[PDB]
Structures are given as C-alpha cells and as structure tokens.
Amino acid sequence: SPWFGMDIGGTLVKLSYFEPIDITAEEEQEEVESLKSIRKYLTSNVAYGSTGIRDVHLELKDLTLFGRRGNLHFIRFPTQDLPTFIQMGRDTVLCATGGGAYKFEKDFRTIGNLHLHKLDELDCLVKGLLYIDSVSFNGQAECYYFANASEPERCQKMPFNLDDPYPLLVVNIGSGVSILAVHSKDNYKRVTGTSLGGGTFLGLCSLLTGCESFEEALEMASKGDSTQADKLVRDIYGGDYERFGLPGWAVASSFGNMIYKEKRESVSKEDLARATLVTITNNIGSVARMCAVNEKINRVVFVGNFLRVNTLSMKLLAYALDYWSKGQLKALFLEHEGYFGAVGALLGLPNF
Amino acid sequence: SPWFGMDIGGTLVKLSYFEPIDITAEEEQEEVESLKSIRKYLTSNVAYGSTGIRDVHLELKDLTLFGRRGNLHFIRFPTQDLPTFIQMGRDTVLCATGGGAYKFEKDFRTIGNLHLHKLDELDCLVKGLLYIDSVSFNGQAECYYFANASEPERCQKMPFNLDDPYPLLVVNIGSGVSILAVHSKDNYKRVTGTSLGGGTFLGLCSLLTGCESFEEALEMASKGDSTQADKLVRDIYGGDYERFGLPGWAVASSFGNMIYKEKRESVSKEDLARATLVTITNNIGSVARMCAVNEKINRVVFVGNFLRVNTLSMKLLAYALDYWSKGQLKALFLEHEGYFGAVGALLGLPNF
Numbered sequence: 001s002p003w004f005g006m007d008i009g010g011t012l013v014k015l016s017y018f019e020p021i022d023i024t025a026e027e028e029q030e031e032v033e034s035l036k037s038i039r040k041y042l043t044s045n046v047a048y049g050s051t052g053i054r055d056v057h058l059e060l061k062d063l064t065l066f067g068r069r070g071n072l073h074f075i076r077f078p079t080q081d082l083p084t085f086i087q088m089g090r091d092t093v094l095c096a097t098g099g100g101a102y103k104f105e106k107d108f109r110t111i112g113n114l115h116l117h118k119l120d121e122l123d124c125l126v127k128g129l130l131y132i133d134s135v136s137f138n139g140q141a142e143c144y145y146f147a148n149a150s151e152p153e154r155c156q157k158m159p160f161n162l163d164d165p166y167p168l169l170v171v172n173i174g175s176g177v178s179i180l181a182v183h184s185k186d187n188y189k190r191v192t193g194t195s196l197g198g199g200t201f202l203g204l205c206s207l208l209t210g211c212e213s214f215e216e217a218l219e220m221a222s223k224g225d226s227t228q229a230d231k232l233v234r235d236i237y238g239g240d241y242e243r244f245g246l247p248g249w250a251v252a253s254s255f256g257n258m259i260y261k262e263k264r265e266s267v268s269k270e271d272l273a274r275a276t277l278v279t280i281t282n283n284i285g286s287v288a289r290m291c292a293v294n295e296k297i298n299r300v301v302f303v304g305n306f307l308r309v310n311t312l313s314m315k316l317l318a319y320a321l322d323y324w325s326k327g328q329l330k331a332l333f334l335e336h337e338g339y340f341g342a343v344g345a346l347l348g349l350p351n352f
Numbered sequence: 353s354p355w356f357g358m359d360i361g362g363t364l365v366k367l368s369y370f371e372p373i374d375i376t377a378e379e380e381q382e383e384v385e386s387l388k389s390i391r392k393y394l395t396s397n398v399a400y401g402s403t404g405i406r407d408v409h410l411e412l413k414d415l416t417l418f419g420r421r422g423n424l425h426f427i428r429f430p431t432q433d434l435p436t437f438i439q440m441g442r443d444t445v446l447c448a449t450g451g452g453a454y455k456f457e458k459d460f461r462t463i464g465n466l467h468l469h470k471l472d473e474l475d476c477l478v479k480g481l482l483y484i485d486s487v488s489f490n491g492q493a494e495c496y497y498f499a500n501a502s503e504p505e506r507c508q509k510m511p512f513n514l515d516d517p518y519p520l521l522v523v524n525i526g527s528g529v530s531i532l533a534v535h536s537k538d539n540y541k542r543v544t545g546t547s548l549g550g551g552t553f554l555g556l557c558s559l560l561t562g563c564e565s566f567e568e569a570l571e572m573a574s575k576g577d578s579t580q581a582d583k584l585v586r587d588i589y590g591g592d593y594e595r596f597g598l599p600g601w602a603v604a605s606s607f608g609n610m611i612y613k614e615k616r617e618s619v620s621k622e623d624l625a626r627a628t629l630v631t632i633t634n635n636i637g638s639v640a641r642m643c644a645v646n647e648k649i650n651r652v653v654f655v656g657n658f659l660r661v662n663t664l665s666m667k668l669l670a671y672a673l674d675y676w677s678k679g680q681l682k683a684l685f686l687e688h689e690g691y692f693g694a695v696g697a698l699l700g701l702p703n704f
C-alpha cells in the first residue's frame with residue numbers, strides 16, 4: 001500500500017507521504033491502477049480539493065526509508081474536512097497519531113479492511129523530530145535560530161546544530177500548547193501544557209476583528225500597534241521600573257488599556273490582532289522559560305503550526321526568551337515544525 | 353496630620369486611614385477645623401463623591417498603632433480619578449507606593465508643603481500582609497482556604513494559620529500579575545510576573561460583551577458556559593487522555609472553538625465572559641504552580657483586587673491548584689487582599 005503517516009490534531013490533519021522513486025519495470029506492471037492513480041494525484045497536484053495543501057518547499061528528496069529510495073511529502077488539511085478525506089478513501093495500513101486518531105477511529109474503520117494503528121503522540125513527535133534532524137533538510141540544517149535577536153539591524157536566521165540534541169525542551173504550539181522534556185532518545189516526558197495557544201490566537205482574533213483565516217489574522221497583526229490595547233509598565237510607573245529590571249515597554253497588563261471606553265472606541269482591528277498575537281506569544285515564551293528553568297534545560301525548540309508563515313511570533317519568541325533569560329536560554333526553530341508527529345507515525349510502520 | 357497609606361496602582365488607588373479613637377479633651381481643642389472636617393467626612397460617609405468607596409466590612413477596630421488606639425479604614429477609588437482627589441486636597445506626610453507614586457509624584461507636590469515619601473512596593477506588600485495577619489481580622493483569621501475544594505458538596509471557606517508564614521509564594525493579581533517569594537521577614541523577592549491579569553479580564557470582557565464594569569463582567573460570567581467558547585480535551589480526543597492524566601473537561605485551547613464561524617454566531621455574551629474569566633484564572637493558577645515548584649514553596653497566597661467579590665475565580669484557583677498539583681499545593685486567600693501595599697506604606701510613617 002502507499003506508506004502514510006497521519007497526525008490528526010484539534011485544527012489540522014498533517015500527512016506525510018513517502019513517494020517511491022526506485023520503482024522497477026516489474027513493480028510498475030504489478031501495481032494496481034488505483035495505487036497508480038493515488039500516486040499521480042498526490043504528486044501532480046499541490047492543492048487537493050478546496051482545503052488540502054501540499055507544502056512543496058518542505059519535500060525531502062531522495063531519502064532512503066525502509067530500504068527504498070523516495071521523496072517524502074508534507075500535506076495538510078483542516079480536521080473539519082476529514083469526513084471528505086474519508087469519503088474519498090471509500091470510493092492499506094494507516095499509522096495515525098494525535099487526538100483525532102482516537103476520536104475518529106471508528107470513521108477510519110469504514111474503509112473496508114483498513115488497519116488503523118494508533119500511535120502515541122509523544123513517541124511520534126520525538127521520533128519524527130530526531131529523524132528529520134538526522135537526515136537534514138536536503139543537506140541544509142533542519143534547526144535554526146535568530147542570531148543577535150535583540151538588535152534588529154543584526155537579527156538574522158542562522159542554522160543550529162542538533163547532532164547531540166539532548167537535553168531539549170520542546171514547546172508544541174498547536175490549538176493549545178504542550179511542553180515536552182527530551183532527555184534521551186528513550187527518556188522523554190510531557191512536562192505540562194497551557195491552553196493559551198494557536199486556537200486562542202485565531203479564535204480571539206476572529207471575535208475581535210472579524211478575520212476569517214489564520215493568514216488574514218497575521219496580516220492584520222502585521223499592521224497593528226499592540227500598545228494601543230496593552231497597558232505597559234511605563235503607563236503605570238511613568239517610565240522604566242529599575243528596581244525589578246522591568247523596561248518601560250514591557251507589557252504590564254495585556255489588553256489592559258481596553259478597560260477605558262474611549263480607548264476601546266479608538267483601537268483598530270489591526271491593533272487588536274497584534275495585541276492578541278503579542279499576548280499569546282509572550283505567554284508561551286514565559287511558560288517555556290519557567291519550564292526550562294525547572295527542567296534545567298537551556299535549549300528550547302518551538303514546533304507546531306502556530307508559527308507557520310508567522311515570523312512575527314518567531315522573532316518575538318527569539319527576542320523575548322533571550323531578553324528575559326538574560327541570555328541563558330536560546331529559542332530554536334525547525335523547518336518541518338508542523339509535521340513531526342506525522343513523520344513519527346510513518347516511522348512506526350515496520351512495527352506492524 | 354492624618355495618618356494615611358496609599359497604593360496607587362494601574363487601575364485602583366487603595367488608601368488605608370488610621371482614625372484615632374483615644375483623642376483627649378486637650379487634643380480635641382488643639383485640633384484645627386480642616387482636620388476635624390476630614391475626619392468626620394471620612395467616618396460619616398461610605399461613598400466619597402461618585403467613585404470612592406469605603407470597605408466598611410474590612411475595618412480593623414481598636415488597633416494600637418504608633419502608640420495610639422484607633423480604627424484602621426480601607427478606601428478605594430479609580431486611579432483615573434486621582435486628579436479629583438488631588439484637587440480636593442488642594443482646597444501632611446504621605447507615604448505612597450505602587451507605580452503611581454512615581455508617575456504622579458509631581459501632582460502630589462502641587463499640595464503645598466506636602467512631603468511625599470515613595471516606598472518600595474515589595475517592602476510595602478510584604479510588611480502590610482505580615483502585619484494584618486499578625487493583628488488578626490478583629491480576632492478572626494485573616495487567611496483562609498477552601499476545604500475539600502474538589503468536592504462541591506463539601507467545599508467551604510475555612511481559616512488558615514499563618515503564625516509561622518515562611519516560606520510563602522504571594523501571587524498579586526492586579527492589572528497584571530506579580531509573583532513574590534517570601535522566605536523571611538527580611539528575605540523576599542519578586543520571582544516574575546505575567547501580563548495576563550485582572551486588566552486582561554476586564555478589557556477583553558468589555559471588548560467581547562460590552563460590559564461597563566468589573567461587577568457586571570462577573571455577573572455575566574456567573575451565567576455563562578465557558579465550554580461554548582473553549583475547545584476541551586474531549587473535543588480533540590473524544591474523551592479523557594489517560595496517557596497524560598488529562599481529564600476530558602480540561603481546556604485544551606481557550607476560545608479554541610471560536611475558530612468556527614457557526615460557533616461564533618451561537619455563543620452568548622455570558623459564555624464569552626465566563627471563558628475570559630476561566631482563561632485568565634487558569635493561566636494565573638498554572639503560572640503560580642510552576643513558580644511554586646521552582647521556588648520549592650508549597651503555600652500559595654493570592655492577593656490583589658481581581659479576586660474582590662469574585663468567588664468564581666477563588667474557587668477555580670482553589671480547585672485547580674489542588675487538582676493539577678495532586679494535592680501538593682494549597683491555595684490561600686486573605687480578607688484584606690487588595691490593601692496590603694497601602695497598609696505597608698502607612699507602616700513606613702515612623703521612619704520619617
């Protein structure tokens with residue numbers, strides 16, 4: 001069958017698909033038409049129906065997996081449209097992780113003779129992350145950071161070596177936030193989580209601004225000024241608060257200026273979008289910093305799709321973790337940040 | 353002069369006023385009319401102008417302070433109306449703390465010959481808290497907790513002994529959140545803070561519901577169902593997530609169901625108010641829990657005015673700290689929770 005790895009999250013389904021490229025003359029004959037048509041459909045389209053997308057730029061080319069050479073493909077669509085995915089399948093071993101592997105188990109079984117193997121999300125994320133870093137991003141680093149994150153004239157994306165990755169704090173920002181401590185390839189745990197995550201950004205921003213997509217929310221936020229909504233340290237003290245090392249620009253109360261009716265009447269939708277993004281992103285950074293201190297881990301890697309096409313939040317995390325930790329913690333990012341669970345599930349295939 | 357302690361916060365001014373009750377015959381004669389009129393005005397009114405309130409139920413009666421017997425009074429008004437307060441003063445040694453002692457320093461000095469003594473907010477809060485607990489609340493406990501916080505048929509307010517208070521984690525929920533670690537009467541520090549505090553609750557709730565006061569926001573929240581807005585663990589997994597001990601009712605993504613347009617069209621204002629309260633309160637509890645673990649402190653006391661007339665948030669904190677800590681942390685509350693800085697400032701008077 002086609003080799004697939006699926007992570008069914010609270011918001012998106014992520015799918016990794018291994019396309020063989022070493023198909024012999026005999027294998028091509030012995031392959032049934034439906035399998036030929038699935039392969040052509042997946043490799044000859046970048047958009048699938050109305051909501052499916054192949055992230056072509058992430059493709060890993062000429063990988064050797066399970067004794068075959070192939071290309072690894074990365075595909076996403078909304079969990080809301082899984083019934084359409086399953087219906088098209090009804091007209092194969094599926095390794096699946098994420099909460100939806102449980103919630104939608106019975107739906108996958110409406111595909112006759114399909115074997116569903118639910119795999120642990122922690123195992124899948126950690127194995128997928130370590131695997132992609134080990135094989136590299138077509139010879140480039142999978143892991144990167146923002147150098148001189150405090151100085152905008154210098155701040156630039158730079159590669160980071162993870163060849164000895166342990167220990168590692170993984171902050172998975174999806175609908176919510178989960179925080180993992182990875183001490184070895186076989187010693188890792190979920191530390192905690194927070195409910196202020198990507199779904200909070202999109203849900204609040206939609207209520208506050210009427211935006212109808214993640215990308216629209218980010219474009220609004222890119223034009224806004226969060227200080228129109230937030231109450232800063234300088235608004236309370238008149239300036240910096242030296243005694244505790246709090247700069248005047250630090251947010252003392254997110255949305256705290258919105259207690260005043262006249263300020264609510266003057267704030268723009270873009271300002272509210274940016275305040276929502278800043279609020280969620282700073283809270284994630286601060287929770288990550290507290291967990292890193294408790295776990296005694298100084299490398300913090302952020303994954304999930306909250307950070308897809310979201311350089312604002314990445315740069316805010318890079319600057320804030322470095323600033324508030326006095327340079328003791330480093331924010332790290334991964335090119336394949338949304339897909340590690342899906343890859344880890346795919347890598348579970350030989351165990352069945 | 354009258355003895356006053358003032359904490360000028362980002363949202364409210366809190367004032368503690370010592371009313372002497374041992375005034376002799378000679379002292380009553382030697383007292384000037386304006387001082388007699390300030391004392392009568394303060395003790396014969398419970399509302400001052402349109403926004404000032406004396407919290408009569410908090411009054412400490414027949415306290416011995418600075419060698420005199422008197423009553424200690426607790427008064428609050430919005431920082432927005434400090435210009436009215438200062439203008440009425442212009443028609444005394446002032447010990448003042450909070451960010452506004454700095455921001456409004458020059459305004460207080462428009463009162464001729466007034467000496468303003470700015471005092472450190474950390475010193476004032478800790479000294480005020482320890483003092484009020486030491487003298488008691490008219491013979492009753494100043495400190496209380498909710499017994500059997502996990503079982504609603506049993507959960508009830510009960511007194512808690514702080515006669516040996518150290519160590520103590522103090523979580524001051526005002527406009528924002530500050531977290532203090534108190535190891536001794538002379539060894540204490542600010543641990544960190546978060547910007548998701550009372551101002552975030554009121555500001556977001558005002559944007560989302562059109563409420564025009566803190567009390568109205570709480571009344572709305574009391575009637576709402578936060579699960580109409582929040583995405584729960586059971587919404588993602590179909591049920592509990594046993595592998596990590598996450599119950600199905602835990603919030604996986606605050607406001608996370610608001611990414612769906614049809615759900616935004618069906619949610620009520622009351623539901624949004626409750627989701628805002630739950631979101632802010634759970635984040636505060638979780639940050640407090642992480643800080644308590646890092647500080648190795650198992651008693652967490654919550655202060656500030658976010659919890660005034662707010663039993664929902666108190667009970668949510670009590671239950672959540674006990675549940676998520678597997679009973680290792682205890683949430684503690686104080687009757688005078690909004691006023692400790694103001695008292696600590698007053699207690700600084702003899703140093704001048």
Ligand SMILES: CC(=O)OCC(=O)Nc1ccc(CC(=O)N2CCN(c3ccc(Cl)nn3)CC2)cc1
Nearest residue numbers: 122176177178192193194604634637638672673676
């Ligand atoms: C391994 C992996 O990636 O799996 C996916 C995953 O875990 N998703 C997920 C993300 C976030 C959550 C929320 C959460 O963890 N909690 C626990 C801690 N909470 C509190 C609340 C109050 C207090 Cl006082 N203390 N703690 C809030 C709720 C739940 C599931």
Ligand SMILES: CC(=O)OCC(=O)Nc1ccc(CC(=O)N2CCN(c3ccc(Cl)nn3)CC2)cc1
Nearest residue numbers: 252282285286320321324474528529530544545546
């Ligand atoms: C002693 C006392 O009661 O004084 C009153 C008082 O302190 N008020 C106050 C309350 C809260 C604040 C906010 C805050 O402290 N921070 C520091 C930590 N932050 C982050 C952000 C990102 C990351 Cl990665 N890490 N940390 C966020 C901003 C500032 C002032």
Ligand SMILES: Nc1ncnc2c1ncn2[C@@H]1O[C@H](COP(=O)(O)OP(=O)(O)O)[C@@H](O)[C@H]1O
Nearest residue numbers: 009010011012173174175198199214304305306
């Ligand atoms: N195309 C998108 N649609 C919806 N959310 C997106 C999209 N792209 C990025 N996001 C962001 O990513 C978050 C979901 O990331 P993800 O890691 O896939 O979460 P989950 O595993 O819970 O589905 C959303 O809450 C949103 O903030």
Ligand SMILES: Nc1ncnc2c1ncn2[C@@H]1O[C@H](COP(=O)(O)OP(=O)(O)O)[C@@H](O)[C@H]1O
Nearest residue numbers: 361362363364525526527550551566656657658
């Ligand atoms: N009467 C009120 N007016 C405004 N906010 C109130 C009021 N009563 C309680 N609150 C809550 O208390 C918070 C302010 O508490 P407080 O400890 O006095 O903060 P600060 O010291 O920053 O002024 C507000 O953000 C709000 O959530």
Ligand SMILES: [Mg+2]
Nearest residue numbers: 009010098174
């Ligand atoms: Mg996920």
Ligand SMILES: [Mg+2]
Nearest residue numbers: 361362450526
């Ligand atoms: Mg305050």
